[PDB]
Ligand binder design. Structure first.
Ligand SMILES: [Ca+2]
Ligand SMILES: [Ca+2]
Lengths: 340, 339
């Protein structure tokens, strides 16, 4: 027996309720005698992990009592986290955005990973609406993968970083494109322009991924849908200039990463014949965000065309295994106005 | 009447919450109320008043106590769900721009800077600042911070001020050597901003008395370098953005959950316009070496004062009108990290 899936169910507490989820995402089991929350399990993984694995095995064989798992009831696996740090591993994407400003990208960007520190304390659940005051802010989804690490020492090596990867999940790094230029122009990175993100209903162990996980990257299309229509099928194993251990090593240069740290891959992006990717409806692999499409329209046609997310739109993100079954469950979110 | 809270280091990640006497000599575990500061903040509307009764008992002698050792204290939140650090003393920003020779857009006087910081691995007040290389421009940064209860997205100044729960000092450890290179990448600070440290004790606004005016702390911030007065800059002067303003800015497009830490940015004072002078010369000095080097470069050509090297010792504390330490002392020796 190999692999397991974990989820956090919304409840009256801030950290929610940890459950072990069946491979098919239909059944789950509370595990309060081992750990009440995912963070607690991570805090003591060396001991809690093996015990959760036995529960996972028991769910598979039916020896373990279960209830129904409802993605609509899931929080993000860590509803609040101690760290959210997001890379830009598909350096093609940042090349496109840099090139749209009609500027050249330093060679250094192929060798030196980007990362930003994100808000970690108020993540949206996979099915919660993206609520915002104003959709003139260039609301955009950003489909990525993330790993959750155990403790990582300051100055960690690649072997250390690899070995510290405990869970994988999908992410929607919600962005406000209209606010980005002026904010970064302040010089202090992202804050207002990067609101609360959302993660998939389930996080899985590397073992669960099977051959789709090479120890440092995922080798599967990331399905991003917009209003029911395929928007991106970009392969997470293609054009990824920096893998997860590389991002982790980068992150740990001058600081430890405590257990529960979430590292984002950055928006998944694919080139086509060495050129900008083309849309799915044209045979291309599409895009994991609307920003990348607009950049390409800007380069191609001198300016953006396709509009960002407006109230009422729906975005879906999920990853399917070789046989077509969902691995992490689905992020599916309706954009709507925040009621104050 | 006010109170002081601390977290003692123990075998767990979140440490042991204690209530601390006003004189910082005694303290008491409060496990029947909350094991951790976070847990108290999570349920503050109920836990807060219970903790206040304990503080009151410590004061009268009714509550059994033990000795408080600042050396055994973690940061009050050893790990936090959020750390966001402003630069509310825009004077400092203007000086960094000046040493480069760019005018500052007048918008920096009405638009707060803020950045997302590492929150998961804070050093304790007396823990050493360990770095692999002291040629990275290791610098201290004295500031004040506030811990907030839940703040809704798009919160107002009134809600902002009402959400302030605790006040503490901070050393925002900075690697100046890496800052230029990192920021040029365009994604803000990460590698150049290592783990920070907070004061041994966090205190309620009420404890601060008049020195707190609801948005601002009005006392000198003591920064020492190897036992010498380096900064005595007043935290209520030249503070162009108050804490509520910092909070409202942070909350524009996101809620802030209970336990969110908001830093004011390095405390800096103008003399009468233009740069402050080094304490030894009658002025209020500085709360970071960087500010000093900017002043040296601007008037003179190039930095003359080195940053922190191994063996250097920094102290950061704040004393009330009567000269008693309010928060306890951050005191750290810079040292070589090795694996
Ligand atoms: Ca991103
Ligand atoms: Ca700072």
């Amino acid at each position: 027996f190999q692999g397991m899936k974990l989820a956090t169910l919304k409840d009256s507490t801030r950290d929610g309720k940890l459950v072990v989820v069946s491979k098919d995402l239909t059944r789950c089991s509370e595990v309060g005698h081992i750990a009440r929350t995912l963070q607690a399990a991570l805090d003591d993984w060396a001991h809690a992990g093996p015990r959760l694995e036995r529960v996972a095995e028991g769910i598979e064989t039916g020896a373990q009592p279960t209830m129904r798992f409802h993605e609509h009831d899931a929080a993000s696996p860590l509803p609040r986290a101690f760290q959210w740090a997001d890379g830009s591993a598909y350096v093609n994407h940042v090349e496109l955005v840099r090139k749209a400003r009609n500027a050249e990208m330093p060679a250094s960007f192929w060798t030196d990973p980007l990362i930003y520190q994100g808000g970690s304390d108020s993540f949206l659940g996979p099915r919660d609406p993206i609520l915002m005051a104003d959709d003139a802010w260039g609301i955009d989804m950003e489909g990525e993968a993330a790993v959750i690490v155990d403790d990582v020492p300051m100055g960690a090596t690649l072997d250390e970083a690899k070995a510290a990867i405990r869970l994988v999940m999908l992410v929607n790094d919600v962005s406000l494109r209209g606010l980005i230029p002026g904010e970064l122009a302040k010089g202090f990175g992202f804050y207002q322009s990067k609101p609360s993100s959302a993660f998939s209903p389930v996080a899985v162990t590397p073992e669960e991924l099977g051959e789709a996980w090479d120890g440092g990257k995922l080798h599967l299309p990331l399905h991003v849908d917009l209003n029911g229509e395929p928007f991106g099928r970009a392969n997470a194993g293609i054009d990824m200039t920096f893998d997860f251990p590389q991002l982790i090593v980068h992150a740990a240069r001058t600081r430890p990463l405590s257990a529960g740290t979430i590292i984002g891959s950055g928006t998944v992006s694919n080139k086509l014949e060495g050129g900008p990717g083309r849309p799915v409806s044209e045979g291309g692999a599409g895009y994991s965000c609307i920003a990348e499409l607009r950049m390409i329209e800007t380069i191609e046609g001198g300016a953006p065309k396709t509009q960002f997310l407006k109230f009422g739109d729906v975005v879906r993100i999920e990853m399917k295994d070789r046989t077509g079954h969902s691995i992490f469950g689905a992020i599916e979110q309706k954009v709507g106005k925040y009621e104050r």
